[PDB]
Amino acid sequence: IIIRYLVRETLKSQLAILFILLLIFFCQKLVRILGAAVDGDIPTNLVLSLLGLGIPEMAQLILPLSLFLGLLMTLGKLYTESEITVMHACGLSKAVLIKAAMILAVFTGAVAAVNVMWAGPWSSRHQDEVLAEAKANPGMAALAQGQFQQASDGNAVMFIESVNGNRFHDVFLAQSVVVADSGELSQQQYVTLNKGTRFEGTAMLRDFRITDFNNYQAIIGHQAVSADTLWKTHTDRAAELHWRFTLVATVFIMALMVVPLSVVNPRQGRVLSMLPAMLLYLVFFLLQTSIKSNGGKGKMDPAIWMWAINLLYFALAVLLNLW
Amino acid sequence: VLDRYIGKTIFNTIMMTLFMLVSLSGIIKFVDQLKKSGQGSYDALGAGLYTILSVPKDIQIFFPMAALLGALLGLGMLAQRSELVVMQASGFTRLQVALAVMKTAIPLVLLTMAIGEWVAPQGEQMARNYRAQQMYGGSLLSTQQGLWAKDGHNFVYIERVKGNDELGGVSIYAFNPERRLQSVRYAASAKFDSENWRLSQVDESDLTDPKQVTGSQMVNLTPDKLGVVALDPDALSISGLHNYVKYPGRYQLNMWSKIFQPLSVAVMMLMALSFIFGPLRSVPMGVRVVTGISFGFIFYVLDQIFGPLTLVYGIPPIIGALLPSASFFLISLWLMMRKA
Amino acid sequence: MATLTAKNLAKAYKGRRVVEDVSLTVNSGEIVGLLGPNGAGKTTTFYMVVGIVPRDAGNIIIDDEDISLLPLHARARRGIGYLPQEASIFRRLSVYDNLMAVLQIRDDLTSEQREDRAKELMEEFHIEHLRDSLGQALSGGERRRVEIARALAANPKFILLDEPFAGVDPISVIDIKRIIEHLRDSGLGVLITDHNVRETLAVCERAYIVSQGHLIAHGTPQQILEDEQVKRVYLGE
Amino acid sequence: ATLTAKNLAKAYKGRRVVEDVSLTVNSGEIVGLLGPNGAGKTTTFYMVVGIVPRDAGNIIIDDEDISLLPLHARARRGIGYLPQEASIFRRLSVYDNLMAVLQIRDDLTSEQREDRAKELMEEFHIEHLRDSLGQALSGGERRRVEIARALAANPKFILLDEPFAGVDPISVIDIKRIIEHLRDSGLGVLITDHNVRETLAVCERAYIVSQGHLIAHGTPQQILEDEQVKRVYLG
Ligand SMILES: [Pt+2]
Ligand SMILES: [Pt+2]
C-alpha cells in the first residue's frame, strides 16, 4: 500500500502544477490573440471566446508535461527527504515507483484520449469557423480607425479616418475606387455615407461610374456558411493521427522516462539535476513538432519519423530503468 | 576590494543567464527555420536567422530577465555560501552591497542602449533581407499581395514591388483639398532618381469639375525606403520608429517600449535586492530560481499582454510601456520599505 | 547466528583513492563500530557495506552467501537494515500505516499476522499512543523509535546505522545507546559509523578504525585507546 | 571592556524560545553559552549577534546599547560573528580577502591597513597562502583565515558559532589553541558548540539555558556537579 502514498503525492503536485501551466499557456495564447487584434485586424468581441476555443488545443502539451514534472518534483522532493532511499533500505523494488507512475499515468492518458477523440476535433470545427458572422461580415465591431482593412484577396480594402462613427473619411473600398466625406453605420446594416465620389474607369476607353451627396445604403449582411482519410480497416496508417495518437503515447513515455531521472542526480544540485531530465522532454517535443511538417494531414502523409523517434525514445526510457 | 567583488559576481551571472536564455530561443529559432526550409537555402537561412537574429533577442526580450534571474542568483549563491553575512559581520553595509549591485547596473544599461538601438535593428533587418532565397511575402520581395499607401490625403496602390527600385504597377490618386480624383496614373516601372520619383508614362485623368473628364496621357512627397516597412514588424530602431510616427499607435508603443528597456534592466536589479533582502530566510537555490524565473514571466506578461491591452481605452503608449515596466519598481520600493 | 563479512574492499572516485585494501567482520547480536578520520576511510567505506557506493575490489558475504553483486535493492531480504541520519519518516503516513505498508512488502507472513507484528512493534518500542498520528508530526526521539521499528519490519540482522548520534544532547544519547544494546539483546548485528567516538566506543564490543584507506585498528576499545599509531592520526590522549 | 545582556526574551508562534536570560562576557574572559537543542542556547547566541530580534531583551556592550542596532553596525563596534561553515570568499585571494574587511576600517591609515594584513598573515601562519585564492583550504588553514579576516574588523568580542563542527579529536587541539591565542589578547570569546567536553575544556565560565530560562552559571566544575543540569543536560 506504499504505492497509495506515492500516488497521493503526485495528485497533490500534478493537479496543482496543471493549474499553474494552464495560466502560463493562457498568457501566451492571450499574446497571439492580442497580436491578431492589432496587426491581423480581427474584432474584439471574439477575443475572450477564442481564448476558451484554444484550451483543448493547449491541453495537448500541459497534460503530458504535468504528469512528467509532477512526478519529477515529487520523486525529487521525496528523494531529498530520504524517503525514497529508505523505501529501498527496507526491502522494496525500483519498480514500486514505476508501478506508482504507470498506475496514475492511465488516469491522465484517459483525459488525453478525451482531448483527442472529442475535444481535439471540436476546436478544429470552431477554428474553421473563426465566427463567420464576424469574419466574413465586418460591422461596427470591426472599426478601421486611422488604418486599412484588407478583405477577400487584395481587391477589397477599406480605409477610414473617423471621429467615432458619425464623420468618416477616405472610405476607398477598391474591389476602381470610391472616396466619401461624411458617413454613418447601424447594424440589424447600411453604410449611410453623405458627400462622396465613385469610379470604375480601368482604361481610357472603358466606362466610369460617379456619385455625390446622397445617403447610400446597400443593405448587405450575407451570413456565410463553413464554405462561403482516417481508420481504414487495413493497416493504412501513414493523416495527422501520427501526432493525434502520439500526444496520448507521450503521457506513458515521459512517466517511465523520468522515474530514474529524479532519484540519481539531486545529490549534486537540487534543481540543476532537473535540467538534464527536463532538457530531454524539450528536444523530444521540439522534434515531434518538427516531424509534423513534411506533408501534414489528408493527402500528404508524414513518413514514420514521428513513431520512429517515439520508439527510439522508449528504448531510451527502458535503457536507464535497467540500470 | 569588496565593492568590485559584488560587482563582478552579479555581472558575470547576468552574462551567464543572457547566454543561457538567448541560446534556448536560438536553438528554437533554428528548428522553426527548418520548418520553413527548401525554397532556395537551408544552412544560409539556418545561420541567417541564428547568428544574425541573436542580437535582437537580448535587449528586446532576455536582457531584463537576465538582469533579474542572473542578479538574484548572483546574490543567491553568495547567500548560500553565507559570504553575505560575513560582509555584514565585517562591517560592510546592506546599502554598500546594494551600491555595488547598482554600480554594475549603469555599465550594463549602457550595453542595452548601444546594442539595442544600433546592432539590434541591424541583425533584425539583415535577417529579413536575407529571406530573398525564400519567396512569397513582403520586404523588397512581392508575390500575391498589393502594397497600399497614403501620401497625406492622397492614395497609392502597387501590384508588385521589386528590389530593382522599380514598381510594377503604381496608381497615385492625386487628392485635391476636397478629396476628388485628378489622376489615375500607371507605370510599367516608375523608377527613383536622387530627389524625385520618376513618373514614367503619365495618365493624369483630371476631374476638377464633375463634367471635367480630361484624359491626359504622356511620358510628389512619395516615400522611397521611408515607405518600405515590409510585413509591418515594429522591431527596428527608436529613430526608425520616430520618423515613421510623424508619417496609428502600434508603432508608437514600440518607440517607448524600446526606451524602457534600459530602466527595466536597472529596475529588475533594484527588485533583485528587494527580494534578496526581503524573502531571505535561508531559502534554497530552488525557491530563489522559481521566483527568479516566474517574476521574469510576470514582467513578460505586463509587456506582451498588458502592453497591447492599452489599445482598449487608447491610453498613450507612455502609460502603456514606461508605467507597466515601472510597476515592477513599485513592488521593489514596497519590499524595501516593509522589511527594513 | 548469521554472519556479515567484507573482504579486500577498495574504491577510487575519478582518480583519488578514497579507500584502499580493507576487510571487516560483524556477527549477529553485537555492536561493531567503523570510525576513522573525516572522509579518509569511514562513511565512504560504510556505504559499500550498505550497498549504495559501488564495489571496485573484494567481496561482501551474508549468511555464508555472496552479496557483492546485490545493491541497496534486495540486500534487506536476508538480513540488511539501514537507518540514515536524515529524517526519513513517511510524512503523510500514520504510525500504524507506514509500519504496516513496509511489513506487507515481506510476503513471508500471514495477512492478519502483520497486524499482530504491528501491535507487537507498538509495545516493543512504546508507539501505541502514536498509532493514528501522522509522520513528521513527531519529536526527535519519537521519530527515531519509528524509524528503527519500521526498518525492523522485514526481520533484518546487521542494522547498519549512519551517524546515530546526530542531536548531541548528553542526556538523549543514553537512551539511544540503550536501544542499540536492545538490538544486540534481540540477537541482531549492529554497525555504527558516528563521528563521536566517546559514545560509540562506550557501546561497542569491537570497532574497526580505517585511515587513508588501509585498516589500522581493531578489537576492544581499551586496546584502541592504548594503541600508539591510532593516537598519531585520530585521538592523541 | 565588557558585553552585557539583560532580561532577553523572544517568542515564535507563542512557543517562547527564550524567557528572561541575562549573560555577561568581559575582555579576556572566554564564556560558553550551552544548553539543550533549541532550548534557548541557539537563539540567545543569535539575539546577541543581532540576527534574531529581541522581543523583551537588552543588548549592551561596555555601557553602549545595541539591542536595536543591526549586524553591520555591531560589527564596526567590536563584534565578530564567525559561522560554523567556510564563507572565506571563494572568488577572492587570502590577502585581498583580508584587505576587503580592512577597506571598511577607517581607524587604520592607507599603509597602516596594508601592514595589519601582513601582521595577521604572520600571526595566523598564512603567509605561505598569500597569492592563493580560497576555493580549496584545509580544515585547519581555512579556519585561521576566517578568524584573521574577522580580526581585520578590530574586534572586542568574538562569537564563535559551533567552532568544533565535525572536527576530529586530532584537529580539535589546534582549533582549541586559536581560542587560547585570542584569549591571550583583549578579546572575549563566546562559544556555543554541541561538544560540551571540548567547550568546557577552554571556557573559564559557562551559561546554560533550558526552555528559555538560565539554570546554570559558573566554572565547568560548578556546572558538572549541579543537580539541575545533571538531569536535564549532562546525564
Ligand atoms: Pt544554487
Ligand atoms: Pt561569566
Author numbering:
A (entry chain F): 2 to 176, 186 to 198, 203 to 242, 253 to 262, 264 to 348
B (entry chain G): 6 to 201, 204 to 226, 233 to 260, 268 to 360
C (entry chain B): 1 to 237
D (entry chain A): 2 to 236
Question: What does the publication say?
Answer:
To understand the structural basis of how ABC transporter LptB2FG extracts and transports LPS, we have solved the crystal structure of the LptB2FG complex from Klebsiella pneumoniae.
The structure was determined to a resolution of 3.7 Ångström (Å) by the single-wavelength anomalous dispersion (SAD) using data sets collected at 1.0723 Å, and the sequence register was validated using sulfur anomalous data and selenomethionine anomalous data. Heavy-atom derivatives were obtained by soaking the crystals in potassium tetranitroplatinate (II) (see “Methods” section). Overall, the dimension of the LptB2FG transporter is of ~86 Å in width and 128 Å in length. There is an extra electron density in the cavity that could not be assigned with any confidence. The highly conserved residues K34 (TM1G) and R136 (TM3G) of LptG are found at the upper cavity of the transporter and around this extra electron density.
